């Protein structure tokens, strides 16, 4: 005699709350994270030329402190400096060290 068509939309057993203009938290069906908050902890040696300073700081590799002579003529895309790198040659100082390093 008569029939019944009903329009509708899907839903899911577990939505995710999202912020909007009016709602701080409202439930959508699905959503993605736009903020990256994790690292592997290691530095990939590619595609950038990562030259590790090890016990030396760029400045000492520059001046040629003996333990650093191993860097003579090195190049890099990113020179990495370690926290406990040390200088073991004539005591010195670099007025405006930050600029020479930069």
């Amino acid at each position: 005699s008569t029939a019944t068509l009903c329009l509708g939309h899907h839903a899911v057993p577990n939505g995710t709350l999202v912020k909007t203009i009016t709602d701080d938290q409202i439930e959508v069906t699905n959503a993605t994270e736009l903020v990256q908050s994790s690292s592997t902890g290691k530095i990939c040696n590619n595609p950038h030329r990562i030259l590790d300073g090890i016990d030396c700081t760029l400045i000492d590799a520059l001046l040629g402190d003996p333990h650093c002579d191993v860097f003579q003529n090195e190049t890099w895309d990113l020179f990495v400096e370690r926290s406990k790198a040390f200088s073991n040659c004539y005591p010195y100082d670099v007025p405006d060290y930050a600029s020479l390093r930069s």
């Binding site: 999202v18 959508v28 736009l34 902890g41 530095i43 990939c44 595609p47």
Partner: protein, 53 residues
């Protein structure tokens, strides 16, 4: 380590797929923008209205 990653941060490399990152403000290469937030969900679907009602 031996792997591939354009974005390097002092905390180690991080994937540059998402637009922003909360790992470190110091970055090198193709990296996401550093922001104070830790999570930012972009809705990718309609509202979810279960048969709760």
């Amino acid at each position: 380590d031996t792997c591939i990653s354009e974005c390097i941060t002092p905390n180690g490399s991080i994937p540059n797929d998402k637009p922003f990152q909360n790992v470190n403000k110091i970055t090198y290469g193709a990296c996401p923008k550093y922001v104070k937030q830790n999570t930012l969900k972009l809705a990718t679907g309609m509202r979810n209205v279960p048969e709760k009602q």
